[PDB]
């Protein structure tokens, strides 16, 4: 009754039906390196970093959309799991420019943390690295689309919680500019939330843009004003 067994690394736990692997791993304390998943949006199996090896399987399935069948045995830290993560991280750092000093998410990137704790160290790919022309999405959001890894998170963001539908994918192959084709200002309410949705330094704050760096600043608890919600 409403309970399904998984052996997450040989550790048995009961899981609600219908849920997927990542919610079970956060139930047992694990994480999985993920990019395009987000805990407020839809699930769109695009990042490919979230892979995990299940026993008796020739492929390696993604841990976002796979439903939990009965009696799994999930190898989060197997051999080809780490091999696949090294491979996909090495793919992600081909078309991403050398803007780590001038970017706005120095301590607060996600590529950097995942590339340390799961990625390779010696690189390849001697020649290439496409460049993408930036847009002016609005005078409140600075936009350099070259740092965009096409992770398709702001699109689902808009199409669900904003409903505006001004940001779409344009192109194929390596050439997929994500943005607005018509150079219209993406301006609505909650548009300030998109600079934290963006998991890389591609959609960032305009008035903050080159004023600080996250490791110097200290955090402080507080409550919102100007609204009855807080």
């Amino acid at each position: 009754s409403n309970l399904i067994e998984v052996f997450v690394d040989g550790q048995s736990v009961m899981v609600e039906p219908g849920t997927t692997v990542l919610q079970a791993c956060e139930k047992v304390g694990m994480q999985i390196p993920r990019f395009c998943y987000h805990e407020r949006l839809s699930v769109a199996g695009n990042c490919r970093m979230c892979l995990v090896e299940i026993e008796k399987a020739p492929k390696v399935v993604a841990a976002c959309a796979m439903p939990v069948m009965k009696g799994w045995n999930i190898l989060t830290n197997s051999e080809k799991t780490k091999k696949a993560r090294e491979g996909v991280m090495e793919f992600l750092l081909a078309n991403h420019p050398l803007d780590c000093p001038i970017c706005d998410q120095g301590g607060e990137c996600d590529l950097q943390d995942q590339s340390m704790m799961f990625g390779s160290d010696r690189s390849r790919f001697l020649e290439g690295k496409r460049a993408v022309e930036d847009k002016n999405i609005g005078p409140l959001v600075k936009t350099i689309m070259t740092r965009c890894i096409q992770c398709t998170r702001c699109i689902r963001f808009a199409s669900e919680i904003a409903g505006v539908d001004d940001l779409g994918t344009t192109g194929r192959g390596n050439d997929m500019q994500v943005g607005t084709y018509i150079e219209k200002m993406f301006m609505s309410e909650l548009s300030g939330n998109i600079i934290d949705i963006c998991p890389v330094g591609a959609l960032t704050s305009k008035p903050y843009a080159f004023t600080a760096r996250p490791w110097e600043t200290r955090k402080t608890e507080s409550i919102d004003v100007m609204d009855a919600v807080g």
């Binding site: 051999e79 780490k82 091999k83 990625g119 390779s120 010696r122 390849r124």
Partner: protein
């Protein structure tokens, strides 16, 4: 050096250790500065196609 042999013999007679040979004041035995520029190796990495970091 740059001294006569009389005081040199006095120095050798004050202590017999061949004072003219090792004089603790080097002249052109110093290896020359602004050397030819170096090339540096990479060790047991940087050879591709095997070296997963999962292995090492």
């Amino acid at each position: 050096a740059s001294a006569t042999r009389l005081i040199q013999g006095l120095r050798n007679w004050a202590s017999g250790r061949d004072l003219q040979a090792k004089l603790q004041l080097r002249y052109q035995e110093i290896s020359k500065r602004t050397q030819p520029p170096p090339k540096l190796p990479v060790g047991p990495s940087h050879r591709l196609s095997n070296n997963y970091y999962c292995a090492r």
